[PDB]
From Swiss-Prot:
Ester-bound lipid substrates are bound through a crevice formed between the LRR 11 and LRR 12. Interacts with LY96, TLR1 and TLR6 (via extracellular domain). TLR2 seems to exist in heterodimers with either TLR1 or TLR6 before stimulation by the ligand. The heterodimers form bigger oligomers in response to their corresponding ligands as well as further heterotypic associations with other receptors such as CD14 and/or CD36. Binds MYD88 (via TIR domain). Interacts with TICAM1. Interacts with CNPY3. Interacts with ATG16L1. Interacts with PPP1R11. Interacts with TICAM2. Interacts with TIRAP. (Microbial infection) Interacts with M.tuberculosis EsxA. Highly expressed in peripheral blood leukocytes, in particular in monocytes, in bone marrow, lymph node and in spleen. Also detected in lung and in fetal liver. Levels are low in other tissues. Residues 4-147 form the TIR domain. Cooperates with LY96 to mediate the innate immune response to bacterial lipoproteins and other microbial cell wall components. Cooperates with TLR1 or TLR6 to mediate the innate immune response to bacterial lipoproteins or lipopeptides. Acts via MYD88 and TRAF6, leading to NF-kappa-B activation, cytokine secretion and the inflammatory response. May also activate immune cells and promote apoptosis in response to the lipid moiety of lipoproteins. It is found in: Membrane; Cytoplasmic vesicle, Phagosome membrane; Membrane raft. Changing R118Q: Reduces TLR2-mediated NF-kappa-B activation. It comes from Homo sapiens (Human). This is Toll-like receptor 2. Residues 1-149 are cytoplasmic. A motif (ATG16L1-binding motif) lies at residues 126-143. Induction: (Microbial infection) In macrophages, induced by SARS-CoV-2 infection. Belongs to the Toll-like receptor family. Ubiquitinated at Lys-119 by PPP1R11, leading to its degradation. Deubiquitinated by USP2.
Length: 149
């Protein structure tokens, strides 16, 4: 396109919206230099359809960031379990997604048909949002690193 690319497309839920739209934005969009983000629940076109918003954002951004939380799992995850004929390269070998664990998640409760997700949890690969405020600086450092990895 003209230059309408993005560093990351961030999918998350409305309940976690404050964190993403304040905390993450200040550490990324307001970083220096800054990152260009497509925020799932802030930049989606109203008229445009759902699947177009998703597929389109994903394709227009270098990476996809999932902000995992109990609520995000119940309310937004499924669409990401079962996917269909669009990534001619299969997301499984397409840079992989960046996962952020905003809060802990009782994987016992996590369905079981959520194969991808369960893996994720076990693989224990994700940037865990620290309870200790003294350790959040490092977190953002890791986040930016990952997005630009």
């Amino acid at each position: 396109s003209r230059n309408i690319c993005y560093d990351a497309f961030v999918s998350y839920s409305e309940r976690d919206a404050y964190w993403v739209e304040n905390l993450m934005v200040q550490e990324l969009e307001n970083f220096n230099p800054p990152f260009k983000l497509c925020l799932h629940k802030r930049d989606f076109i109203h008229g445009k359809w759902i699947i177009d918003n998703i597929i389109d954002s994903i394709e227009k951004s270098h990476k996809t960031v999932f902000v995992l939380s109990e609520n995000f799992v119940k309310s937004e995850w499924c669409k990401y379990e079962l996917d269909f004929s669009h990534f001619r390269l299969f997301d499984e070998n397409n840079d992989a997604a960046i996962l952020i664990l905003l809060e802990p998640i009782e994987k016992k409760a996590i369905p079981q048909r959520f194969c991808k997700l369960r893996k994720i949890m076990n693989t224990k690969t994700y940037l865990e949002w620290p309870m200790d405020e003294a350790q959040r600086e490092g977190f953002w450092v890791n986040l930016r690193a990952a997005i630009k990895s």
